[PDB]
Amino acid sequence: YDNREIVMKYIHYKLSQRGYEWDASEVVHLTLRQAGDDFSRRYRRDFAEMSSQLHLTPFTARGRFATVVEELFRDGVNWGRIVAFFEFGGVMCVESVNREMSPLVDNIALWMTEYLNRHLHTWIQDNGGWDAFVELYGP
Ligand SMILES: CC1(C)CCC(c2ccc(Cl)cc2)=C(CN2CCN(c3ccc(C(=O)NS(=O)(=O)c4ccc(N[C@H](CCN5CCOCC5)CSc5ccccc5)c(S(=O)(=O)C(F)(F)F)c4)cc3)CC2)C1
Questions:
Q1: I want to staple 132 with a disulfide (CB 3.0 to 4.6 A). Which of 66, 109, 125, 128 is the partner?
Q2: Could you give the number of structural domains in the chain?
Q3: CA 90 to ligand 1: nearest atom
Q4: How many whole angstroms separate alpha carbon 11 and alpha carbon 106?
Q5: Number of alpha carbons in the 13 Å side-chain half-sphere of residue 125
Q6: What is the CB neighbour count within 10 angstroms for residue 37?
């Protein structure tokens, strides 16, 4: 499955729900959206803390993203951390819009796509690909 499309559909949906029409395998997209909503409710303190402590500006966004992503996957990968990675990118995009720095969304989407293609892709494929994530979540 194309990771770039997965990132784009995911971010696009999150922003559209804030009235922001961003100028940017259906089961996979819907499943990821649901798993991410579940993650953010089940781990609300983490979600809420990250959201309020970003201190996001165009000068720091890339460094904050790199730092958090390296910390997230430090002890290895699992599907829950992959969902957390998407929700973190979503928090970054959402905060960028809230702070009137919406152009950052494009950079964020690229960094997410790159990290998936360069660092998560092998793990994902070794686990059977996104079909495995779909099965695990249900469908
Ligand atoms: C260092 C740093 C600061 C870095 C940055 C950062 C951070 C801070 C803010 C933000 Cl915003 C982002 C990141 C943190 C914060 N940290 C990040 C990691 N966090 C994790 C917490 C739990 C797991 C886990 O549990 N991982 S797991 O064991 O692999 C597993 C288990 C169950 C399910 N899904 C089930 C679904 C069951 N069905 C539902 C449908 O009805 C049928 C039954 C439950 S919902 C569900 C439950 C959990 C996850 C997703 C969905 C899935 S999953 O959905 O991915 C699936 F199923 F595999 F697909 C996978 C992995 C990591 C904890 C908090 C730390």
A1: 128
A2: 1
A3: 11
A4: 10
A5: 10
A6: 12
Residue listed under structure tokens 């996001």: 56
Structural method: X-ray
* Ligand 1 center to 24 CA (angstroms): 26
> Which atom of ligand 1 lies at the shortest distance from residue 71's CA?
1
Q: Is the CB of 80 within 6 Å of ligand 1? A: yes
Domain that holds residue 81: 1-139
The verdict on the CB of residue 79 being under 6 Å from ligand 1 is: yes
Dump the DSSP string for the chain. --HHHHHHHHHHHHHHTTT------HHHHHHHHHHHHHHHHHTHHHHHHHHHS----TTTHHHHHHHHHHHHTTT---HHHHHHHHHHHHHHHHHHHHTT-TTHHHHHHHHHHHHIIIIIHHHHHHTT-HHHHHHHH--
Resolution (in Å) of the shown entry?
2.0
CA distance 116 to 123: 10
φ and ψ of 43, to 5 deg: -120, 55
Give residue numbers after which the chain breaks (C–N above 2.5 Å).
Answer: 24
Encoded tokens for 38: 């579940």
